[PDB]
Amino acid sequence: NPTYFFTFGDSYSQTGFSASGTQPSASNPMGNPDLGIGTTTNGPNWIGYLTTTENASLVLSYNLAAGGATIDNALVPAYPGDLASQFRLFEDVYADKPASAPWSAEDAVFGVWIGINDIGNAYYSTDAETYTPKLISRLESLVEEVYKNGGRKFLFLNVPPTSRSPLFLEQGEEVVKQHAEYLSVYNENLEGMVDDFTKKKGDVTTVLYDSWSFMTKILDDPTAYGFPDATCINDDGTSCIWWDNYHPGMKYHLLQAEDMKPKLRKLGGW
Template structure:
């Protein structure tokens, strides 16, 4: 939702007093929303996500991070624990301000530090395209690989998926007051593998067998999450970055080889997700096929508002940053 549309919905909430009103924490706008855009007396529409929040919890107009607070027992929050690389990262620090109703991304202030310079997919899903209060702990780190011992990141300071999961296990996994999550009201998502395959596809040895090595490490971490109570898992596969300008600048064989490695990894990921559910009780899994959806856009870029499939830089009409 654009800022102007958010302002418009806020205005409707102020003037349409005769309409049915949404209760505190109730939805009052968003993609496809056809219900009330007015909030009950004493509450205001949040500017960051279309939901009615108490006046005292409304986000600051300055955009600065609010002080830490704990969701009250009456707030039916859902908790999202996210892991990944720069496609997901928002520069969140688990040692700083935790997610809370007035800033569901926690820190930094929405949308955080992203590779796009603006909201990324997890920002939008937490703040805009949601039907309930979602508090997101986003451990994703730019440049991350699954394990630095298997695929070294571009700099040793990068937190791998292994590091990110350990951060969670040493913090929010213990269910502090700011994150009283349960297996039923929490989601654990992982979007990883892009940097691993970018580093490994051209190495010597059996590249397809290496996909198994990477996935062994990833799902050993997923098992640790399950062991502390995680039950709902969202996985995102590797997008077709063989079609990126960077990959296309290589030799004529670069893109086809890279494509084969990515597709092999994604096929094996599907099986690992199925095995996770089959071998553990009470597990619900979701898999978003970013590979297919990216290809749909790249095959018809102008249909989706992009200039073409290969231009890159800064601009709303460029697919590649």
């Protein structure tokens, strides 16, 4: 009895899944590509680990996340495959519960990890207090589309401290600071929206996962987690926190998936 795990996000979540590629099944839960391909980690990412390593029952992953994504190109633009476009792909292919993915309220989980690129692109040019509500409102309206299709179980990850990635560290401490302060307001507004949605609907199961505090713990004490420091890069994905200057590696993603597992019990697959 599968859990249908539909995910939406950016390069922290991408796996290169195609809606026309091999589709998820019990024998092949990711569908396509093979587990550990198509990521920014050198191996599985958090979704691959939640689906195949940390799962308590059968999870089928339909991963619509796309590199570089922002929430909506009408707000902060970047790449064609924004979050809005990912929801449209869901609308086009899976929303009507095809025989390939015959989901229902009781067994579908919709996971969203977005905001890294909205913040990365807008932190110096917009006012967080007035602008981040616009971003969060658009996220909420996309979530409402899935609610209208019958979705009831939702997972939201807050934005991790990309302020402390090598890419940002190299821009100077005051840029790190400006980015981090803007990010904190976005994350607060995200939490507010998730709480408000949960209460207003009354028939949903939600999880807000605080990836920010988890990654910050590791950055603050890297050797406690088997990393030599909080700044080194290694494309093996395991010697350093960072796989490249802006993305954490497979070891980090596994530690995050393990941290998430108990928090996801209420969603049915863990």
